[PDB]
Design a protein around this ligand. Structure first.
Ligand SMILES: *[C@@H]1O[C@H](CO)[C@@H](O[C@@H]2O[C@H](CO)[C@@H](O)[C@H](O)[C@H]2NC(C)=O)[C@H](O)[C@H]1NC(C)=O
Ligand SMILES: *[C@@H]1O[C@H](CO)[C@@H](O)[C@H](O)[C@H]1NC(C)=O
Ligand SMILES: *[C@@H]1O[C@H](CO)[C@@H](O)[C@H](O)[C@H]1NC(C)=O
Lengths: 50, 49
């Protein structure tokens, strides 16, 4: 049996499998709250950032 | 109040965001556009035994 698609891949920076990487690419995570850390919000841009 | 690159129309004075608050103003003496940003804030948590 071939389990290389679901076993973790050490080449990635985060140890996730190929199918896990596919699911993480399929979901577009738009709710990144504390990734901004308010510095990028303090730098005000003319584009309407939600 | 910060300097901004907003291209105001000559008849426009104030700018409004999605929530209909004032976001950009025009300085009445020298014709310059200023962005208004709320001051720094955040949550405070206490970790204690
Ligand atoms: C188990 O499956 C993997 C993936 O199908 C095989 O590894 C290679 O994976 C690459 C993609 O990263 C493919 O392009 C190659 O065709 C795959 N094969 C080879 C020979 O390189 C792996 O060979 C399979 N192992 C077994 C024992 O079936
Ligand atoms: C208006 O549009 C031009 C080109 O589309 C751009 O260079 C300029 O910065 C814009 N003005 C703004 C965003 O105030
Ligand atoms: C008065 O307002 C005009 C309007 O543009 C400006 O050019 C001028 O510099 C102002 N004078 C003073 C003393 O602020």
């Amino acid at each position: 049996f071939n389990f290389s698609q679901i076993l973790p891949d050490p080449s990635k920076p985060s140890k996730r499998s190929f199918i896990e990487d596919l699911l993480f690419n399929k979901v577009t995570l738009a709710d990144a709250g504390f990734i901004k850390q308010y510095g990028d919000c303090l730098g005000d841009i003319a584009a309407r950032d939600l | 109040l910060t300097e901004s690159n907003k291209k105001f129309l000559p008849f426009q004075q104030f700018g409004r965001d999605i929530a209909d608050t004032t976001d950009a103003v025009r300085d009445p003496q020298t014709l310059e556009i200023l962005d208004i940003t709320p001051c720094s804030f955040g949550g405070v948590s206490v970790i204690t035994p």
